[PDB]
Design a protein around this nucleic acid. Structure first.
Ligand SMILES: Nc1nc2c(ncn2[C@@H]2O[C@H](COP(=O)(O)OP(=O)(O)OP(=O)(O)O)[C@@H](O)[C@H]2O)c(=O)[nH]1
Ligand SMILES: Nc1nc2c(ncn2[C@@H]2O[C@H](COP(=O)(O)OP(=O)(O)OP(=O)(O)O)[C@@H](O)[C@H]2O)c(=O)[nH]1
Ligand SMILES: [Mg+2]
Ligand SMILES: [Mg+2]
Lengths: 171, 171
DNA sequence: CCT
């Protein structure tokens, strides 16, 4: 296995294109109440599936819920694309304010893996250009994550490595 | 600053071309007895500064000293180039054997910075082709370090980032 | 400088 160490109080930020397997991974490794996804926060704002007209409100709600869980000292996982620096920065600042380590888990998979998974999804699908763009953004982001303020940066480079991951939580 | 977290029980493996500043960095951040350098181990095998033939024995000696220190529960830093996967593999095995975390600290500096520091050092220089080779080997190594078994991988991407490092040791 |  590939062991990824995280502090008992962490903010775990998943970073990956649509189709990279972020939500699948979060379900496998974390309790449901530890995981706050952008899709869930959109669903609070709208009774339409994956409503694109409420994006800003949904991310405001995600930041708020994340902050209040960290205030209570509860480990939290942010399940969103997080491929833009502008997306990650508030999460780093929130972790700081609550004396929490921010941890990056990056799904560094080839674009084709994500494009192929996308076409077979039974929940929702995105257009090909979205995944092309996310993948470019993700790859561009890797080098500067430590400098951005992530205390541990874990990069997963294939489905096989993702599959092998085990988390070790430290008190 | 850039905070690098390491457990009190760590094997810290410095990875970098000749000239990248490994020994200077080790001296700034760790106690002298914590640092085992390949240069010191060659010196135990020969007073001939340029006796090429002692390299294999010197690394056997280095590995054994590291083993015994980790067995004693003493944090140890390996001060050698560590740019070949074959050099890192036995160090990872040692850390595992004594239930210690192997940590990678990578001096990802441009070849030119290393070449210039080599030209200007007054202690012991290497030939230009050596630094060209080391830098190529170092860059090729970065992606695979986590999969080799390093539990924390810290990449320093400029002299500015190297100077900003502070270690936080956690027990 | 793991030649
Ligand atoms: N074979 C295999 N398929 C996977 C794996 N992980 C995810 N998938 C499939 O890939 C598709 C996308 O997975 P998700 O976890 O929803 O991807 P995501 O990164 O959350 O995507 P977004 O929510 O759009 O950002 C789903 O149909 C998954 O079942 C995996 O580890 N192995
Ligand atoms: N300006 C500046 N010079 C440095 C720094 N670190 C090292 N140097 C200089 O670079 C030269 C080599 O530094 P070392 O620490 O000996 O490099 P090394 O990586 O141990 O080299 P090898 O033992 O040959 O593998 C010395 O002359 C240092 O004074 C630094 O952080 N800033
Ligand atoms: Mg998802
Ligand atoms: Mg040195």
């Amino acid at each position: 296995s590939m062991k990824l160490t995280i502090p008992e109080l962490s903010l775990v930020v998943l970073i990956g294109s649509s189709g990279s397997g972020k939500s699948t991974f979060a379900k496998k490794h974390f309790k449901p109440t530890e995981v706050i996804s952008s899709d869930f926060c959109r669903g609070l704002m709208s009774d339409d599936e994956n409503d694109q007209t409420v994006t800003g409100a949904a991310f405001d709600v995600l930041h708020y819920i994340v902050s209040k869980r960290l205030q209570l000292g509860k480990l939290t996982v942010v399940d969103a694309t997080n491929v833009q620096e502008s997306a990650r920065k508030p999460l780093i600042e929130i972790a700081k304010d609550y004396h929490c380590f921010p941890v990056a888990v990056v799904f560094n998979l080839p674009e084709k893996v994500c494009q192929e998974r996308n076409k077979n999804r039974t929940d929702r699908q995105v257009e090909e250009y979205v995944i092309r763009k996310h993948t470019q953004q993700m790859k561009k982001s890797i080098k500067g994550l430590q400098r951005e303020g992530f205390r541990y940066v874990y990069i997963l480079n294939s489905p096989e490595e993702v599959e092998e991951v085990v988390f070790e939580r430290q008190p």
